[PDB]
Short mmCIF file of C-alpha atoms and ligand atoms in Angstrom, two decimals:
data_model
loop_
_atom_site.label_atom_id
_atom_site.label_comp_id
_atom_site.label_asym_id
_atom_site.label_seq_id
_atom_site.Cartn_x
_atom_site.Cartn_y
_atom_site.Cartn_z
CA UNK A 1 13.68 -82.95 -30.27
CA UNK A 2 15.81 -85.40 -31.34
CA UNK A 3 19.45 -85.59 -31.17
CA UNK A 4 19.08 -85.84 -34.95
CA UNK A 5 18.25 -82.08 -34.78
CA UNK A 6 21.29 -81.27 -33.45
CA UNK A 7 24.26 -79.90 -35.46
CA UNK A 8 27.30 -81.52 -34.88
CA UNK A 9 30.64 -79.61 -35.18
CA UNK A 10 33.78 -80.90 -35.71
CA UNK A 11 36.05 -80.33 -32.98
CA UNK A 12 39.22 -79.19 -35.09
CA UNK A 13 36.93 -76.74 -36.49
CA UNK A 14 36.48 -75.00 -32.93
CA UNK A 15 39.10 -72.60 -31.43
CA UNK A 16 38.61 -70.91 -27.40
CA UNK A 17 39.64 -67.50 -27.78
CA UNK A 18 38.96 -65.96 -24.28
CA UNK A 19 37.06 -66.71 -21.11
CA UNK A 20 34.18 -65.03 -20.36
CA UNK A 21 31.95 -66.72 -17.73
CA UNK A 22 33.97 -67.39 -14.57
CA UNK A 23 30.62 -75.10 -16.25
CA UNK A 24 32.31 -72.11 -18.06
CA UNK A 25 31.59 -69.89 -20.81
CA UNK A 26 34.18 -68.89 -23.60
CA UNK A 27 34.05 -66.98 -26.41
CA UNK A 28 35.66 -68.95 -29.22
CA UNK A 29 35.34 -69.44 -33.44
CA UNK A 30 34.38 -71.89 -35.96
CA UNK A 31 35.78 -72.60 -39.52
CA UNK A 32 33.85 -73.32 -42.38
CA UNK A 33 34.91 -67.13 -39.57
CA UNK A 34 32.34 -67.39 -37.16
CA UNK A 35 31.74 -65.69 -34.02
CA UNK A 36 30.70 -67.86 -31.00
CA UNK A 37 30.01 -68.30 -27.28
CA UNK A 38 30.98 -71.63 -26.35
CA UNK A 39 29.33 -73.64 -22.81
CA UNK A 40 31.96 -76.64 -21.26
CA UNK A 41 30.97 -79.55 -19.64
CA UNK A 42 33.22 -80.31 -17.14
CA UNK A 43 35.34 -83.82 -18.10
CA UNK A 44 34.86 -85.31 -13.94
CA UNK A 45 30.94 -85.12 -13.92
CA UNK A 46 27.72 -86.96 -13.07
CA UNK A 47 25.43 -89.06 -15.28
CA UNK A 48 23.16 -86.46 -14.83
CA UNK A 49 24.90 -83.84 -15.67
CA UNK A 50 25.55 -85.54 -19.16
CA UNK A 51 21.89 -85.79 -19.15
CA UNK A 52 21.08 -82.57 -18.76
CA UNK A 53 23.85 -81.00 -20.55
CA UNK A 54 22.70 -82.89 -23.56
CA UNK A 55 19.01 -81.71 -22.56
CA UNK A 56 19.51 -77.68 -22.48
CA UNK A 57 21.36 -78.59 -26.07
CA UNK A 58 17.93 -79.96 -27.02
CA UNK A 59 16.12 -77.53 -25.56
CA UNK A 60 17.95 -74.65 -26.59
CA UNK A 61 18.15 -75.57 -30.22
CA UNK A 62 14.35 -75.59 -30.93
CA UNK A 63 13.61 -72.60 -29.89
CA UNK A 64 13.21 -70.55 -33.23
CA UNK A 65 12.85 -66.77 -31.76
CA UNK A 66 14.24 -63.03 -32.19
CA UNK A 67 14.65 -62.44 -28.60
CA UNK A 68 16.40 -65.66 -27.31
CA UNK A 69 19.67 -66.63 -27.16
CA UNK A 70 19.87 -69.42 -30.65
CA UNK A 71 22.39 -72.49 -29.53
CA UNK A 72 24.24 -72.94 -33.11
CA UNK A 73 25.35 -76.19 -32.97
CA UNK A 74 27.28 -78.77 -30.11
CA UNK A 75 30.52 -80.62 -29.90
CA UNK A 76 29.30 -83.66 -27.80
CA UNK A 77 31.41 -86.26 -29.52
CA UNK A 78 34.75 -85.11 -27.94
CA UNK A 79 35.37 -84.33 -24.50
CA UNK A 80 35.26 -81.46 -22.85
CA UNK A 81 31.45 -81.57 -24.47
CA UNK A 82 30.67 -77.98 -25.97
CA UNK A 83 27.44 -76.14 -26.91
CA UNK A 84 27.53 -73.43 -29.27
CA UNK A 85 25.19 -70.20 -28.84
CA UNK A 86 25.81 -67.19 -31.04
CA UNK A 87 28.17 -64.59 -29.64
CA UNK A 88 26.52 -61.91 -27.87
CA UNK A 89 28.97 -59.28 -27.83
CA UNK A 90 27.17 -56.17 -25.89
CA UNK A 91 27.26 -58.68 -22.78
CA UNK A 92 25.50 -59.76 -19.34
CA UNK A 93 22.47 -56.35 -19.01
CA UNK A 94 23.15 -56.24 -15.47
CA UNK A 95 26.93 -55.04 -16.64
CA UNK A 96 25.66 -52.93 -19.02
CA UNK A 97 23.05 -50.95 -17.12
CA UNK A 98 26.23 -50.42 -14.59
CA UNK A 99 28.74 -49.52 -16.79
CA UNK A 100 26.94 -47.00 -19.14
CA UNK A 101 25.06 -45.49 -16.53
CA UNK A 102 24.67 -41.46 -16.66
CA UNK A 103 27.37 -39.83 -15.55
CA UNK A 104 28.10 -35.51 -16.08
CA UNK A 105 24.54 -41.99 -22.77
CA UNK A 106 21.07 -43.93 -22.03
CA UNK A 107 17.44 -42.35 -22.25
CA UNK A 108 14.16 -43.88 -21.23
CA UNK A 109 13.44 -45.14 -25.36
CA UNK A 110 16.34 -47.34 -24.72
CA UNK A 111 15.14 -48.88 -21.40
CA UNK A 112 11.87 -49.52 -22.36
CA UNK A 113 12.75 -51.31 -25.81
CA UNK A 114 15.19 -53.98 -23.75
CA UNK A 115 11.95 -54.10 -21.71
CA UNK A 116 9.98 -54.70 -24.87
CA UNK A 117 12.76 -57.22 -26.28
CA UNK A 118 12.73 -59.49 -23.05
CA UNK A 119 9.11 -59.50 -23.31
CA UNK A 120 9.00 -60.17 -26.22
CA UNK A 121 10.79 -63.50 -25.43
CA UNK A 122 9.12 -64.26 -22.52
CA UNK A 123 5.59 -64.21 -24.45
CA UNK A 124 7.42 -66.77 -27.06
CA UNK A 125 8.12 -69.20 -23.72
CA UNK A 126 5.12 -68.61 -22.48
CA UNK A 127 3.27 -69.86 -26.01
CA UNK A 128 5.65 -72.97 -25.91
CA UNK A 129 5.03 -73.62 -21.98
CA UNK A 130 8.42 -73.40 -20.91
CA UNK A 131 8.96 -72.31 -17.22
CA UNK A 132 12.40 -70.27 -17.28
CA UNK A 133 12.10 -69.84 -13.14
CA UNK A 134 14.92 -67.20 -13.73
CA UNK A 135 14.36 -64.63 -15.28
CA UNK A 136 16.71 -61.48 -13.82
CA UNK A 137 19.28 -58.91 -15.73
CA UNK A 138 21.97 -61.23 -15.26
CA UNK A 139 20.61 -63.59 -17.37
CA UNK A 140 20.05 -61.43 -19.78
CA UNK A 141 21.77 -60.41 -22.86
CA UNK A 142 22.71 -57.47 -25.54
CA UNK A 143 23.79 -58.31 -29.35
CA UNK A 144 26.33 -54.57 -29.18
CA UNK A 145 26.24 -51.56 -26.93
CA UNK A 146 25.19 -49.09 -29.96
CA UNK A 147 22.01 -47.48 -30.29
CA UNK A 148 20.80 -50.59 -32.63
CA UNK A 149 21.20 -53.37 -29.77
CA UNK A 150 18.66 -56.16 -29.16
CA UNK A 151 18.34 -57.74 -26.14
CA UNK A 152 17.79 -61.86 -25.65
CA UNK A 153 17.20 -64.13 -23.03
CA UNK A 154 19.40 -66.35 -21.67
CA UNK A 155 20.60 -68.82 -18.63
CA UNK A 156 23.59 -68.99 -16.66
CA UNK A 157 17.58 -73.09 1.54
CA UNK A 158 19.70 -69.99 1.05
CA UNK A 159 20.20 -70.59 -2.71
CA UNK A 160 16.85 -69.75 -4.11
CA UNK A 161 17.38 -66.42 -5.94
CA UNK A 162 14.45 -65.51 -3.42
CA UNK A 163 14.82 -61.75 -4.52
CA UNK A 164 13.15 -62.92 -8.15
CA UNK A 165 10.57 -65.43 -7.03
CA UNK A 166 6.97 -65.14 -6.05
CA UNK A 167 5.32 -66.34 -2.53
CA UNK A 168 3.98 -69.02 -3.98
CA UNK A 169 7.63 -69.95 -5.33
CA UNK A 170 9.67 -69.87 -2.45
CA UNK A 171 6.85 -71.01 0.48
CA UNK A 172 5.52 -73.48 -2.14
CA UNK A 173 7.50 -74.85 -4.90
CA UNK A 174 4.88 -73.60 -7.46
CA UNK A 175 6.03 -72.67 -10.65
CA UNK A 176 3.87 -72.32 -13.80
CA UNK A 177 3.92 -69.26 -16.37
CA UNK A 178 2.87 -66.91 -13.81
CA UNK A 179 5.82 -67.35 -12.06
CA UNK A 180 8.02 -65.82 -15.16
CA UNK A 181 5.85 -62.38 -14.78
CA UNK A 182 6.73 -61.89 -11.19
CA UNK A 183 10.05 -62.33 -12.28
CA UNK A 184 9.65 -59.85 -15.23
CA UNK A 185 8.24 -57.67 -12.78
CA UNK A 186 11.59 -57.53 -10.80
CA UNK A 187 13.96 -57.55 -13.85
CA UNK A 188 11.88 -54.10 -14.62
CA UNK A 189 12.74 -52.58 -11.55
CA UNK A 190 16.73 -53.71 -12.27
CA UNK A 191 16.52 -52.10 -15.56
CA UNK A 192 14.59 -48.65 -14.90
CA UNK A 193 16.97 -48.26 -11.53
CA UNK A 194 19.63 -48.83 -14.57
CA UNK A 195 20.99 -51.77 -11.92
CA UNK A 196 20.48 -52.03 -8.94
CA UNK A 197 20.41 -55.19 -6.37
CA UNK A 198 16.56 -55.13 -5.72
CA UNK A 199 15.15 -54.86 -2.10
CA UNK A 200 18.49 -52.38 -1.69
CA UNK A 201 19.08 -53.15 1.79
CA UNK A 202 17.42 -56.51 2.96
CA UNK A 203 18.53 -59.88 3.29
CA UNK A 204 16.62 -62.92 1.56
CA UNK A 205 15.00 -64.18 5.04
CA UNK A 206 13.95 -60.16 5.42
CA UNK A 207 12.49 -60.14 1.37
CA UNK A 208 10.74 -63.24 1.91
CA UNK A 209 9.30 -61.68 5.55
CA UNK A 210 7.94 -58.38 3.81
CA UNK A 211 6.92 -59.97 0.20
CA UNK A 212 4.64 -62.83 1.82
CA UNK A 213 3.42 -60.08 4.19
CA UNK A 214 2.48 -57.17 1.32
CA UNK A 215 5.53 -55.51 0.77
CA UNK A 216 6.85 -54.12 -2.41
CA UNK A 217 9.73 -52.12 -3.81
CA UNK A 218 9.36 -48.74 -4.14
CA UNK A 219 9.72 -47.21 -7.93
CA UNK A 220 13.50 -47.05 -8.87
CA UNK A 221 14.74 -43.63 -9.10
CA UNK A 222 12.89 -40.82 -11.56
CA UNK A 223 10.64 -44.13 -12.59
CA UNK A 224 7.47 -43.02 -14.58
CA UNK A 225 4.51 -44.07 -13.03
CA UNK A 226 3.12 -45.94 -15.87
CA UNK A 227 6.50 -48.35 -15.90
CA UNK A 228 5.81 -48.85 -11.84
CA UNK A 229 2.10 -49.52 -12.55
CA UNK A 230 3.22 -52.78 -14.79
CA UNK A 231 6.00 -53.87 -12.25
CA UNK A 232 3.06 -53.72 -9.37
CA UNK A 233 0.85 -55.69 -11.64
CA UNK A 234 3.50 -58.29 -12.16
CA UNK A 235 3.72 -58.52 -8.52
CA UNK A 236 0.21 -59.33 -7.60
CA UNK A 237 -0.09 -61.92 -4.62
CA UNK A 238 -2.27 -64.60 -6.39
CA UNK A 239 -1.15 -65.64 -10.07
CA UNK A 240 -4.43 -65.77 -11.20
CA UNK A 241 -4.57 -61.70 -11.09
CA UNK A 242 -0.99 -61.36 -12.58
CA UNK A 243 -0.98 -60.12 -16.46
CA UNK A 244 0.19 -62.70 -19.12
CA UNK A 245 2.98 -61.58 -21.35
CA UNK A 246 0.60 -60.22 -24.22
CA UNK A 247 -0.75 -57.57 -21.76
CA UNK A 248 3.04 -56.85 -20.42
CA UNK A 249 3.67 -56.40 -24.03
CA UNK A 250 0.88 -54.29 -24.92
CA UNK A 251 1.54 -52.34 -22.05
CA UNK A 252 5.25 -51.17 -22.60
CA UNK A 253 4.37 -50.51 -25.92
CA UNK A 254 2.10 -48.06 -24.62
CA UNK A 255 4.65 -47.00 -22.31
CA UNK A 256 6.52 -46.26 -25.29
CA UNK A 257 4.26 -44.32 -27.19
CA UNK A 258 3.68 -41.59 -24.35
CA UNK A 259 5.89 -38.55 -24.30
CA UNK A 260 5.53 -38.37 -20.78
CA UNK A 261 7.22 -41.28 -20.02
CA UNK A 262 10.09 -41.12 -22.94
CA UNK A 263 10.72 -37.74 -22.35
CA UNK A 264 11.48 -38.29 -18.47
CA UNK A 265 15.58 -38.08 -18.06
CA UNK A 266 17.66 -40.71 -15.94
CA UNK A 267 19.01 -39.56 -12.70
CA UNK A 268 22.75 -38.68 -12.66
CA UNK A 269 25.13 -40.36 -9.72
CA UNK A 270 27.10 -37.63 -8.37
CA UNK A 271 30.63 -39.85 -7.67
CA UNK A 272 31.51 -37.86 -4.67
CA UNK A 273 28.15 -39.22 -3.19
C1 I3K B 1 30.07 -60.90 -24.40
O1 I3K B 1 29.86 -61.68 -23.19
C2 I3K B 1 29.04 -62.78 -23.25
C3 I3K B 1 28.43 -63.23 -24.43
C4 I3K B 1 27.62 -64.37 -24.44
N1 I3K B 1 27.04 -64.77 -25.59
C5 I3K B 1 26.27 -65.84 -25.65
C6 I3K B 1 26.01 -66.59 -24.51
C7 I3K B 1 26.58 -66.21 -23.29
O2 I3K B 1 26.37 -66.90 -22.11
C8 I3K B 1 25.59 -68.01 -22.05
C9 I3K B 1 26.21 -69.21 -21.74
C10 I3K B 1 25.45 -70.36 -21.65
C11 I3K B 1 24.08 -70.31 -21.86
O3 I3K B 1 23.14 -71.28 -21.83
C12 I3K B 1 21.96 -70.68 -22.12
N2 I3K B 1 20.86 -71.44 -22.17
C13 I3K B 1 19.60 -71.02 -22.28
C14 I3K B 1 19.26 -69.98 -23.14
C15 I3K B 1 17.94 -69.57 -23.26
C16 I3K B 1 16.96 -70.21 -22.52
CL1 I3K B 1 15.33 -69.68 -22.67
C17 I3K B 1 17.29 -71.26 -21.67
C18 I3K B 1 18.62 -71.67 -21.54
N3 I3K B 1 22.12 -69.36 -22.34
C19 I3K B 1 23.43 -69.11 -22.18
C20 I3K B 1 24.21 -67.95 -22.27
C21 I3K B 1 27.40 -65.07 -23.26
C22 I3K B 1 28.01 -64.64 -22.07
C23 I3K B 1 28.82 -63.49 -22.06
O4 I3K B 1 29.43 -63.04 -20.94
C24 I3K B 1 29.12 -63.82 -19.75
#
């Protein structure tokens, strides 16, 4: 990847309409009118973070894929030093699975194809050996709210997100592709319990207690069994026994073609509690 390969925009052509990331994230427009997200460097930084702002440009840009985020050009010639990424307007998932929760709008189809989508894009890492080591609803993101939306990937001690990482991960400092499906595993759980904070009640130093000793989540709420079976599978203890992403693939699609599972409703949160 050369810097070759990246498309250079002419500041004057860019415009920040609103903030949306509180580096930061904008939304903001190009002339030739197109719709962007826009990622800052901040003007007072390191050499290295030049470097690797310049490097997630690079990295970014050749990936050619349906289910991650595309980076549609850079401003790195003026300061502050922009990437481009294509506007995804439905937003964060994490947001979404709160906000449209049932109330007396979702169904299990939808669930499972955002499932399928971020799978899809984790298979497409995978292939190209790239290590995301984050994968988590946050991070991930919807093209609209409608019926039609497609979901992508994308990126945003005591700061470890411990809650998302294997043993091997947090006692270790071992990351490789299996690392990714662990992660999947627990991005599964926040979708189906349509998003929750996962291990509801316990601290990191408590997670990373009952994970390297065993312990697991329980299935989110109304959670059919064949969804919990590839969440448990995701979270076996030794990599070498965890599914790649073909088999997660194959196996929500499977999920998806049961009438057991699609049929199943979504609980309903009773406000009064
Ligand atoms: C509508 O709201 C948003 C739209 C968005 N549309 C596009 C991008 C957004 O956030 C970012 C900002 C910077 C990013 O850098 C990356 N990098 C990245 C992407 C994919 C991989 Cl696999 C690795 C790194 N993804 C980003 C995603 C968006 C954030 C939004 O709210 C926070």
């Amino acid at each position: 990847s050369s810097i070759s390969d990246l498309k250079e925009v002419p500041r004057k052509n860019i415009t920040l309409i609103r903030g949306l990331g509180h580096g930061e994230v904008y939304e903001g427009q190009v002339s030739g009118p197109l719709q962007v997200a826009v990622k800052t460097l901040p003007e007072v930084c390191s050499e290295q973070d030049e470097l690797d702002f310049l490097m997630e440009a690079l990295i970014i840009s050749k990936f050619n894929h349906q289910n991650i985020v595309r980076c549609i050009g850079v401003s790195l010639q003026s300061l502050p030093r922009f990437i481009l990424l294509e506007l995804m307007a439905g937003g964060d998932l994490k947001s979404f699975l709160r906000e449209t929760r049932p109330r007396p709008s979702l169904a299990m189809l939808d669930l499972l194809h955002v499932a399928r989508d971020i799978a899809c894009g984790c298979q497409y890492l995978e292939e190209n050996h790239f290590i995301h080591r984050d994968i988590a609803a946050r991070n991930c993101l919807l093209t609209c709210p409608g019926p039609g939306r497609v979901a992508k990937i994308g990126d945003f001690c005591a700061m470890l997100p411990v809650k998302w990482m294997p043993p091997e991960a947090f006692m270790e400092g071992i990351f490789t592709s299996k690392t990714d499906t662990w992660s999947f595993g627990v991005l599964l759980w926040e979708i189906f319990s349509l998003g929750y904070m996962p291990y509801p009640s316990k601290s990191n130093q408590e997670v990373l207690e009952f994970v390297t000793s065993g312990g697991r989540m329980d299935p989110p709420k109304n959670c059919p069994g064949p969804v919990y079976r590839i969440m448990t599978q995701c979270w076996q203890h030794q990599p070498e026994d965890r599914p790649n992403f073909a088999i997660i693939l194959e196996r929500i699609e499977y999920c998806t073609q049961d009438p057991d599972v699609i049929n199943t409703a979504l609980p309903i949160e009773y406000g009064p509690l």
